[PDB]
Amino acid sequence: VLSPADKTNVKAAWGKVGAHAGEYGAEALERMFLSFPTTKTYFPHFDLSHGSAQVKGHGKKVADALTNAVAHVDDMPNALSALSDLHAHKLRVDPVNFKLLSHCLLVTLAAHLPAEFTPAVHASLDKFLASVSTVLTSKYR
Amino acid sequence: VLSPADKTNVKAAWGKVGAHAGEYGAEALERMFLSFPTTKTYFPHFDLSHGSAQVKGHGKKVADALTNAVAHVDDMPNALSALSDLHAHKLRVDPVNFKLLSHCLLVTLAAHLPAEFTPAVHASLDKFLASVSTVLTSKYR
Amino acid sequence: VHLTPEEKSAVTALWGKVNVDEVGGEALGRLLVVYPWTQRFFESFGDLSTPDAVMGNPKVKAHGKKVLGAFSDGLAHLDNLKGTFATLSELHCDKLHVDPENFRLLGNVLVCVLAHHFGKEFTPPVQAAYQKVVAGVANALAHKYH
Amino acid sequence: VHLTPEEKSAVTALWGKVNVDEVGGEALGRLLVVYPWTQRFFESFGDLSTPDAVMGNPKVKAHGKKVLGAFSDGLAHLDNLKGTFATLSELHCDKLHVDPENFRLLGNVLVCVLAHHFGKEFTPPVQAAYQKVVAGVANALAHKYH
């Protein structure tokens, strides 16, 4: 559960991504694939070589989805229903993997936006990503 | 996120607890303290002896709180705000403990309501308790 | 090695009354229903689309029997769970890549199943002893991860 | 933990530039801020009521320095992490009863702090190597639990 402060911290921090959406999203994925090889088994049909075009494009989709989630922070189950169908119903992704990508997203943000990554903001971002993770791994329809 | 069916299942099963509230709550607590002794650490000044009146009373409080959560399944953050202040802000309970008590509540329900404890209901109650745990362990103000 | 002599006696006494042909399938079935992502590791088992489909799936019941057989082996060698589950640890960890948290989950689902069947008989002390057993089995299975 | 010679060189090069006076304190500090329940283990550390209080707390900085020192020793004995952390594991598991999941959390927080300090120098390949290390350290710390 996010506090009013968590919501404003996330909006301010993620709002700095801007035109770096695809770059950061792609990097977060690359960090996950390299650091936790098992996550690669969910993308067997993907070209996972470093810097692959497919990963770059997908990184963009993930980043933009997060931007949408930030915009609908007060009604994520509703706004993310489609992604839940994909990750929970079709892909059946194990929740541990969401923890791994969430961690890699925090690492990416810390490496690119040091001034934004304060302890309180870090806390809010972790709660936010955990929230998104719960919606994507829950079958609520 | 609970599905409409989850909400229906939770209400029906918990509805069957009725006057057995304090009884099941106390048993769940006793099961937790005996199975996971570290949990006793959160109640340093309690009389945790078997069958103690204090645990019987506390079990009734926990049970009644869940009954309330059930009644407000669509807005638990608001309804359980005071309990979140206590567990998250003051006690700072490690979420691992909520998993322990939730499991003990399921074991208690399974031991008392075999006919109601179907796989589908079991699944729904688990999600409900996880949701309650998330609310009580988050500082959203 | 971790259970007290009394805990071992309790576990052994109860296990003697367990239906080895039903409990395993019930436990595996519920794992698949309660924690749906686990269904991904059983793609070839067929229809797992609904609770009834899962619980009535012959392959689920048959496999559960093997899983239970493994738990029985563990209960007969409580002081050496690491060795008893060594081979299975390589399979689940090195080959299947099952996250260890799922081992703990299956263990607790088994406990719920035991409570469901035995009811009043599954007393708090009996449960405490079994929590030691399933935690030990989960730890042994994740051994290759250590 | 198995690190390629290239990974070893990259890890060592980065670690040699780490600010030993602050990095450890910032990691422990963020742990206490991001996962509030961990504060229960540090009752004697004084004021931890707010993020700023936690981060600027002299006791948090001092203790974080010891934590970093423990990681530094692990890096020097990657071939024998169980032995290097035997004593620390007994303390964290048998005495403090710290839940294993928290060891993993602190390890990843340290990774976030390294990323924060080194920016682009903390590349994905560098992180991957460090994840092997923190996982290895985390495992060793929890071995007395097995």
Ligand code: HEM
């Ligand atoms: C913060 C959490 C996550 C977000 C926001 C997210 C978002 C997305 C989005 C936007 C898509 C594209 C859907 C479309 O337009 O077709 C997608 C696809 C997918 N995601 Fe995620 N995802 C997350 C976590 C994960 C995790 C942890 C895994 C597993 C390691 C995963 C595995 C997949 C797979 C396999 C696809 C299908 C890709 C394809 O074949 O096109 N996702 N995700």
Ligand code: HEM
């Ligand atoms: C299903 C989840 C839980 C529910 C619904 C719940 C509910 C409650 C309620 C109603 C109270 C009494 C509040 C009052 O004084 O008015 C309470 C107190 C307390 N709870 Fe929980 N609780 C849950 C889980 C836990 C867990 C997992 C722990 C720790 C292992 C815990 C530790 C405490 C403590 C220490 C107190 C205060 C005791 C005192 O008076 O000193 N609770 N809880």
Ligand code: HEM
């Ligand atoms: C924690 C206790 C567990 C025990 C005692 C156990 C035991 C077993 C046994 C005895 C086998 C058969 C090995 C063989 O003959 O090759 C097996 C296979 C398998 N187990 Fe487990 N297991 C456990 C947990 C899990 C969990 C939690 C998952 C996944 C979420 C899992 C997934 C599998 C899969 C996919 C197979 C192979 C099935 C096939 O033949 O296709 N196991 N397990």
Ligand code: HEM
């Ligand atoms: C996984 C990485 C960890 C490392 C490398 C680490 C390392 C250390 C070291 C070096 C000490 C000092 C021991 C001594 O001087 O004898 C210590 C003490 C302690 N650690 Fe950890 N630790 C870790 C994780 C944790 C976690 C996650 C917690 C709990 C949230 C924890 C709680 C404590 C506490 C309470 C003390 C005692 C401090 C005191 O009262 O003096 N540690 N740790």
Ligand SMILES: *Cc1ccc(COC(C)=O)o1
């Ligand atoms: C609001 C919020 C932040 C994190 C989470 C999920 O954590 C759990 C599972 O309790 O919910």
